[PDB]
Symmetry: none
């Protein structure tokens, strides 16, 4: 009769022990999977950090490429001014010769020598002018080329914007999940511990029941 109610207690102890035994098993198996990424996770945080330097290096490189193109632009702007100076010299030479010829013809036979020479100085001037306009042509292609370069570089910066943003969001996410994990692990330990201690206190009490 009294021994009858004893079997209930011992039974109840078996219920407690089985539960705590399973809570311990499950939480330890869970801690394991968590922990087995806490290595793979570190390489990643180290990788993002290094990735940031690369971003920074790229952002500057693009900046350098730009100011550099701006340089040849300045250089082209000068070749253009300088070539126009050659063009002017060519034209100043041209009328002196032309007018020299006119005067040459004014004089008799002697003029012929000069007249022949003046005639060639002219053709050489008109030939010079020609080379000038050809150089100007290549100057305008270099201008066109540069513009396309800069625009291509701005197309690079715009697209690289998202690359910077997404990596920052990665570091952020990473910090928060590490934290999430810690709280999980932390809640399983604290819980397992107090629950195991509880069943220990229950089992002891039960040992007393059967003991006497």
């Amino acid at each position: 009769r009294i021994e009858e109610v004893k079997e209930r207690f011992v039974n109840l102890n078996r219920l407690f022990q089985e539960l705590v035994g399973d809570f311990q098993a499950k939480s330890d198996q869970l801690v394991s999977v968590i922990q087995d990424m806490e290595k793979i996770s570190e390489n990643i945080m180290e990788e993002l950090k290094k990735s940031g330097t690369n971003v920074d290096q790229i952002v500057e490189r693009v900046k350098e490429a730009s100011s550099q193109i701006g340089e040849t632009l300045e250089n082209i702007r000068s070749i253009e001014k300088l070539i126009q100076n050659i063009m002017r010299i060519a034209r100043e030479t041209n009328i002196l010769a032309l007018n020299a010829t006119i005067e040459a013809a004014r004089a008799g036979e002697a003029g012929k020598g000069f007249m022949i020479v003046a005639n060639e100085v002219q053709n050489l001037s008109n030939e010079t002018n020609e080379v000038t306009k050809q150089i100007v042509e290549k100057a305008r292609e270099i201008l066109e080329s540069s513009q396309r370069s800069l625009e291509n570089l701005e197309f690079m910066a715009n697209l690289f914007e998202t690359v910077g943003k997404t990596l920052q969001n990665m570091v952020r996410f990473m910090e928060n999940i590490v934290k999430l994990l810690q709280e999980v692990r932390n809640s399983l330990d604290t819980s397992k511990e107090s629950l195991s201690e509880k069943s220990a206190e229950i089992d002891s009490a039960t040992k007393v029941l059967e003991e006497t």
Copy 2:
């Protein structure tokens, strides 16, 4: 005697429950974060792949910019060749002029006006030469700028490759935690449900005892 054990059991059960009840409350709130974390994970994964395709575009664009710089190269060399041509013409004009002065010397004062013109035809020749030397100085600094930017673009090209790689690893690891979170959520979900069932039964049996005997 049964009583001291009976009260001990109740008290312990009562506390036992409070702790189990507390685990459930914490478990639920973690499960709420996990679910909110799975979604965020889904977006960061989309952003990653968009960056992956963006980088691919830049990879192709830099190849283009190098072609543009290379074309300026062709042009600038084409200028130097034309500049030499002008220079030759200047030398030729100079002796033509020098020969004129020298032949205007030979023909009295009947031509001491062709001396004047011949003299500045010479002066303009030398002017052309000076100018041209500055065009070369300038034309070389462009090649110096061109090469320097072809090198900067090469280091850029490879720099975008390391970024493309890193992005591919990020995707790897993202897919890899999306998995980890899912497992943890599943693990809590079932552990909460069976803890509730098992503990409910031990709570019921305790009360059955507490009243009898």
